[PDB]
């Protein structure tokens with residue numbers, strides 16, 4: 566349910582924030598929240614970007630606008646500032662979700678534990694977040710990934726058949742993956758990416 570990538574790949578800020586604000590609730594689909602540190606990270610960053618955007622939606626109409634306006638505003642401090650920094654981290658939590666969901670949809674699993682999703686959560690964490698966490702934070706995120714629900718309970722919860730659920734996730738993944746990949750491409754192109762750990 567994300568907007569299709571526009572012809573020119575300039576992602577509009579407001580509709581983006583609106584769409585991705587629907588993602589933290591899925592971490593609540595089993596009742597007690599799952600992967601809470603990932604949820605909290607995404608949520609907190611969305612809030613920070615929306616706060617900058619809301620001050621001047623026309624100035625911050627696109628995500629590229631955020632980066633270029635804040636670069637001008639903040640000089641040498643940029644990109645470790647403002648909505649740019651928040652989106653730098655948001656894209657990592659969003660990529661976590663992308664890789665996790667794609668891995669599940671592709672039937673990736675531990676053949677000895679086919680109803681767990683630990684292999685899929687570990688893979689997603691490795692590709693999206695792990696490089697950017699210190700040892701304390703790694704232990705936090707690690708505990709959450711380990712306490713993942715059963716695969717069957719996860720799929721049930723999103724469907725509140727299993728194959729039909731997976732088809733819907735695959736559909737979602739098309740514009741979702743493209744959008745995230747465009748954000749990553751922009752960060753690299755603008756030299757807005759930082760590698761510091763938390």
Ligand SMILES: CCCCCC
Nearest residue numbers: 588591592662734737
């Ligand atoms: C945890 C995010 C799930 C999103 C499914 C559409």
